[PDB]
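#struct-pred

JT: dropping the chains for the assembly here, can someone run the whole complex?
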Amino acid sequence: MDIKYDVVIVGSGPIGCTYARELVGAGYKVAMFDIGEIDSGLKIGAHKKNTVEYQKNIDKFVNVIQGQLMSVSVPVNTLVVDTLSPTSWQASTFFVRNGSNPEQDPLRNLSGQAVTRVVGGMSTHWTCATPRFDREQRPLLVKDDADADDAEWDRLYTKAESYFQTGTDQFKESIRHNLVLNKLAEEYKGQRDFQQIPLAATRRSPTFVEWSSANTVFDLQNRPNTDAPEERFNLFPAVACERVVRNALNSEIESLHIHDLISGDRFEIKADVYVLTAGAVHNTQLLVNSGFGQLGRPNPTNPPELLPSLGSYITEQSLVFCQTVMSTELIDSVKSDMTIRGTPGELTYSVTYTPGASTNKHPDWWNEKVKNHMMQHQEDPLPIPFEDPEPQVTTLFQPSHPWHTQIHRDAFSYGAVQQSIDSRLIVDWRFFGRTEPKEENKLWFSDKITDAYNMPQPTFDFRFPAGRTSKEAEDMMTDMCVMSAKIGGFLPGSLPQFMEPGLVLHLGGTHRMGFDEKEDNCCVNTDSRVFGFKNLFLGGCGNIPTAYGANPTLTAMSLAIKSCEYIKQNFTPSPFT
Amino acid sequence: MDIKYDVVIVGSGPIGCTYARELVGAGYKVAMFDIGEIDSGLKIGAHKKNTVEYQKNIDKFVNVIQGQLMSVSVPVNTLVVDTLSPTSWQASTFFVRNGSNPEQDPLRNLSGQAVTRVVGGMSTHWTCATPRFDREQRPLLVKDDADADDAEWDRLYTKAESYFQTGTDQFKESIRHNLVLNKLAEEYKGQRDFQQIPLAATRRSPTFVEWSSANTVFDLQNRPNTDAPEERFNLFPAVACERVVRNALNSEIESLHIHDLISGDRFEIKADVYVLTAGAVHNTQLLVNSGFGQLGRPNPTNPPELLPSLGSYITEQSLVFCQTVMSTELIDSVKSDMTIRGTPGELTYSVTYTPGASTNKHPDWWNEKVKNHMMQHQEDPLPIPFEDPEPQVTTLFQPSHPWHTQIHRDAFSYGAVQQSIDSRLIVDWRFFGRTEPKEENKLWFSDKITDAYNMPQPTFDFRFPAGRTSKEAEDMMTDMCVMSAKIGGFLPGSLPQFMEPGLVLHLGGTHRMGFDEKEDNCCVNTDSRVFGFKNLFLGGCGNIPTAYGANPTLTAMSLAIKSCEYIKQNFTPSPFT
Amino acid sequence: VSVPVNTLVVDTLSPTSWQASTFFVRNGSNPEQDPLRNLSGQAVTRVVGGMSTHWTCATPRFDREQRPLLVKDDADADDAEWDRL
Amino acid sequence: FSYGAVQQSIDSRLIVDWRFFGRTEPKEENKLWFSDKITDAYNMPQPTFDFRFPAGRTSKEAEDMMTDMCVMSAKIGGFLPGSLP
Ligand SMILES: *Cc1cc2c(cc1C)nc1c(=O)[nH]c(=O)nc-1n2C[C@H](O)[C@H](O)[C@H](O)COP(=O)(O)OP(=O)(O)OC[C@H]1O[C@@H](n2cnc3c(N)ncnc32)[C@H](O)[C@@H]1O
Ligand SMILES: *Cc1cc2c(cc1C)nc1c(=O)[nH]c(=O)nc-1n2C[C@H](O)[C@H](O)[C@H](O)COP(=O)(O)OP(=O)(O)OC[C@H]1O[C@@H](n2cnc3c(N)ncnc32)[C@H](O)[C@@H]1O
Ligand SMILES: *Cc1cc2c(cc1C)nc1c(=O)[nH]c(=O)nc-1n2C[C@H](O)[C@H](O)[C@H](O)COP(=O)(O)OP(=O)(O)OC[C@H]1O[C@@H](n2cnc3c(N)ncnc32)[C@H](O)[C@@H]1O
Ligand SMILES: O=C1[C@H](O)O[C@H](CO)[C@@H](O)[C@@H]1O
Ligand SMILES: O=C1[C@H](O)O[C@H](CO)[C@@H](O)[C@@H]1O
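RK: done, full complex below.
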């Protein structure tokens, strides 16, 4: 490790890797630190679902996700256990136990909020949905010219889509995908459009998809190397970044304090440019530990002079979920072109279709799959092939329906026991609401309590705002109930419900963007530069200042690309030496 | 990849790595294949619990284990779901769904049996307990000379302990460990001895333990390399090994058929020596798919001519579990040397001890820890420091108590919700029974049904034998109830119970060892050579032919060392070229 | 009314406990009953007063659409008969 | 009905139950029959059902009914966790 770099990046998630891809490519001497370690095999920071074994056992990947989601703020537990043996030591109070945060009001929390500390961040396990935001959900990059704003976002999103390898074609030959999409498309009378979820992924075979990740964006190999002999990049895992050192004027960062978790030793690293991409929670934590904002319980009587909007106006999406069991009508529709005679398993049974007939509702590729499955597996009562890929359907956020939708199969909440209902019948429904930014909704950090890395303990003070946000959230629930019914009834044990606040992991606005610090109640400008500072940039969903329902990562990446352009325009790389 | 090696090893678990360590070191040109992929970071095949983040969040590692335990044989599901919507497609029968095995009697299964397909095998997640077996549990290596047999086992176990870095000192400064061990030691009136569980692990700091794994045994890096320029080793992950090719005489293996899971292509690999270390289930599967034993449902009327004992005499241990909440008496004992005056949190409160006093029950290191914790954390009602390591206690199997015991904290069954009871109070109890080998207890492979890798589907026909095994299992349960009571009452939700058969993952005897194929009803000799074959060896717990309660891996490793000695005595490495 | 034969797998019995080899008829179950074509929730009450000793007491009338005819070809007469009753 | 077993954590004054009841088409195939071998607790022929909700109007309406409860209930409040539709 050197003591001086051109650029230091904190965090090796997909957003930190966006900065690495852009700036390593442009010739900067870059160092990247991550508190977590190299996990994913020899492709550093890659998607953990890209093993042959997981894609043959997709029901097991939920466990991998759960194993790297560490809760942000757990309130003191008040469950009464009164069936202990009289001999066992028994509490007299509900004291602070087992990592709980005594600052946390359990009734004003994001209990589901969690963080992932591994190289590649949450992109080692994510669902890879990368929709664009429409104007209604999106911050302005150009103030008073909507066409210019549109053109800027189109350019950035197109580049981000390339970095992530976003596509909308990978599930086109799925019978289940078609069954669902086709039904919904026909039922909404032209007024809501259904398409494939945009997914950061490349199909390699009919039963394997290479899901994208941080590694897709930037391979995280140290440089120079044979393939990039004139690039300069070092990744340092197991390094907790603790403090950026401000000058007196709050115009420059002069150093980064790091803690090597293997040796235990602490160091300071100099750079020309500091980029914080540690996640929406941990960017904020690092800044607060560095003297930005206000440490401790908020108090308006003494509001912070440095970045007063930091940790305020936080947003998290409402999330509703259910699963459905495909309707009899839809299952029969799969085989509607078949002539079926006799009884399965008996000598005289047959399933035939007429290739190319005009009366057929499906193309030959579909009917071949169905016929062969029905004839070769007469023990099986469904017409859907066993290896048929999952549905991946959305109708995107619109004014009339201001929520994102995913009608799909997610690796999350498989759970623990095998499904009794055939998997080919099951479809997940996830609708995601937008949350109004409100000053009262805060992420703050204790001045006494510390987390597992001896850093100020995060605490939420959050409620979904009472007006539009709440009305829309409940309307969203209703919409999922109505729309899902067109596909099938609810699966027992996966009935319509709101998920624990924050379990969705789409937190934004913790270090939010705008044009003017005071007027727009914000922390970074449109180049993601922290107001007042020449050389400090923040990347991630914490920059997004708007109420958004769609998945935020692509938007955050687009903002990071724009920020890198600024850096390239304003800092000279050091000579390669 | 070459088409010819001196030695081919199937499986990169700790047993395959024992063969690699011994034979790569001795100058053989070695190839190793694993169906699974490089997981554990840059230390190939290492323990996944060796991240800073897991050892700060030990409650989360259960998820990692669950995520790589793929059930061996799941019977057809017969749960009645009668609350589907009338529109949903509804089954008329309990048909084969969701990977279930229609060959499997649900009432004669090892439902908990599972396999792990990752480089390093189950050693990437295991608990690292490596006790020796006493004579009663151990197969003979020398037939009619107990002293010679003892000396052979001592030599092999000592080497295996070195390979694994087994020790019994890593938890000596734990207050909780001491509290438990000291109490039990005093209560058994000299007739049962308590010691630390022997653990394959090296402590690096008071809050970090480097758990051993396959990587400890052999680092799995390709050779030649800078550190080993005259060694020759290649690891090939994502390669399913499907068949060994027998000659007509069943005296030699002529080839190994492999399937590259990335390209999809199939190849054949030649070696002088073939070693199968794919686990107790998958060794058996590979052999059966190669024409050993009998494919399909057993039928005595047509018993196999080649290795007729293969897949018979299988053993799995009964496992009983509970957790306890430490007694008030034990908690008060922690602070017995303290003079405590006043009320915690008040001006006049104090906790003192007299260093070096003869009346003290504890040494100064203990009383310093307790005093500082009690004075610095007056909000906390327990005298045990927050970072105190976990207990790791055993009384080893003996004739009078023929079960292994672990009195400890295991990463398995943390579960899902935070504990309401303080973790410092909680102790896990796992007692492990020995199971008599019986011919009727079988692992067999379907001639029609295939698993996810298109290999014959494993099916169990197992019941715990009715006599000694069953009497001992129930006596073992009682013993855990009696012994645990000395420490505290049961923790609600972790009451004394038998675990699902096979969840313990200590299956043995599937390809068992003995001196004479017919007389000892066995498959390999004491060099782990398959009877009749010059060049085929099996390694792993499937070799162990006895009823054993202790954890089998160290014993299996010892047998593998002996097998490697035979190979070194009988095959010449090729010239380094 | 009709409880099908139970097929829940209990595989954590102690080895000493008597363990079934089949899903035999146990505990009042009806071996005639297909569990997948049942009214599993159907039940009966055998006490004086019947189910009216516990019911919710909701007593709506049926409109024509739900109601059997008491008069065959005169809807007004049918309505008048039902209103009276 | 369905108070259950544990005290409600949510204040009872806030809680409203929703029960929507569908109509089922009479179909000859839907039967209540009695075993000629198996007997009930009063030594009478054991009742057995052979029932499925009919596939057409009955089923369409049942699912539309579910939707209607979801839509209508929303006007009053969100679902109570543990008592989801
Ligand atoms: C968990 C998850 C997330 C997810 C999702 C499904 C699941 C189960 N599905 C998504 C989807 O379909 N579409 C989408 O847009 N997002 C989805 N997500 C969320 C997505 O993964 C995140 O939005 C994205 O990963 C955020 O990227 P970012 O690069 O900003 O942050 P990160 O991935 O959390 O990585 C941050 C890294 O910083 C390291 N760290 C944290 N603190 C420090 C300190 N102090 N020092 C050094 N390094 C630090 C972390 O270890 C992490 O690697
Ligand atoms: C899961 C587990 C295991 C465990 C334990 C706790 C848990 C949660 N605690 C233990 C303990 O405290 N003490 C002990 O002695 N054992 C404990 N275990 C069990 C232990 O992990 C196993 O006994 C040991 O790992 C067995 O070693 P072995 O090398 O024989 O087998 P393996 O680890 O299962 O690895 C086999 C490899 O073979 C590959 N494979 C399988 N099939 C194929 C084919 N056809 N082709 C190529 N490769 C194959 C697997 O992928 C695996 O890596
Ligand atoms: C249980 C229940 C029922 C109920 C309800 C809520 C509950 C929890 N809420 C209702 C409501 O709001 N509105 C409504 O219209 N009905 C509601 N119900 C159903 C209602 O209680 C029943 O429809 C009504 O009680 C039926 O009356 P009926 O007089 O026809 O039948 P019964 O109450 O079941 O009584 C029958 C008696 O016969 C005796 N018995 C049975 N077998 C024999 C033989 N072989 N020999 C002699 N006596 C016999 C029974 O013991 C019973 O008392
Ligand atoms: O972005 C998302 C959120 O963070 O996770 C959900 C469940 O995995 C995903 O379905 C969704 O794509
Ligand atoms: O060897 C073992 C078995 O395989 O797993 C148990 C739970 O992890 C362990 O406690 C035990 O050490």
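JT: nice. The radius of gyration of chain C is 23 Å. Helices of chain C lie at 75-84.
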